[PDB]
């Protein structure tokens, strides 16, 4: 498994636990309603160690860029400013966020041809599945 295999545009086809995850983050009602109803695309590109992830929907588009292995300031879709590091490890992209004494992990892996995106904060989990599109 390589980071290249994750590249391209992906469309959300299933979500479980996302509202619970947003509540654990303390996201307010407007962004939680938007997160319930959006069906974003995720666009992953990677040029060696330069990674970009763009989340695109009619309601909100966000994007970040980083160098794998390097700490950077991420503005999240809910507006937190986290210290983030992304790495490709054990056949998954792993994105670790730390802020104000809190931490959350997001993983992205290929399973049976789908992109499986998992999030956790304090044992509150979500799984979002995306299918490859053109
Ligand atoms: C603040 C109350 O919000 C709602 O009832 C509501 C919807 N329905 S759709 C949407 C919102 C809130 C703002 C984001 C989009
Ligand atoms: C963490 C806060 O996340 C959000 O506020 C958020 C999304 N987040 C995601 O889609 C996320 C993931 C994913 O499936 O790529 C993994 C990290 C969060 S998608 C979206 C919103 C809020 C606005 C509408 C669409
Ligand atoms: Cl949408």
Curated annotation (Swiss-Prot):
Q: Where does hexadecanoate bind?
A: 130
Q: Where does (9Z,12Z)-octadecadienoate bind?
A: 128-130
Tell me which Pfam families the record gives.
Lipocalin (PF00061)
- Provide this UniProt record's keywords sorted from A to Z: Acetylation, Cytoplasm, Disulfide bond, Lipid transport, Lipid-binding, Nucleus, Phosphoprotein, Secreted, Synapse, Transport
What is any one of the record's Gene Ontology cellular component terms? postsynaptic density, intracellular component
Q: Which PANTHER family match?
A: FATTY ACID BINDING PROTEIN
Return the protein name.
Fatty acid-binding protein 5
To which species is this protein native? Homo sapiens (Human)
Higher taxonomy: Eukaryota, Metazoa, Chordata, Craniata, Vertebrata
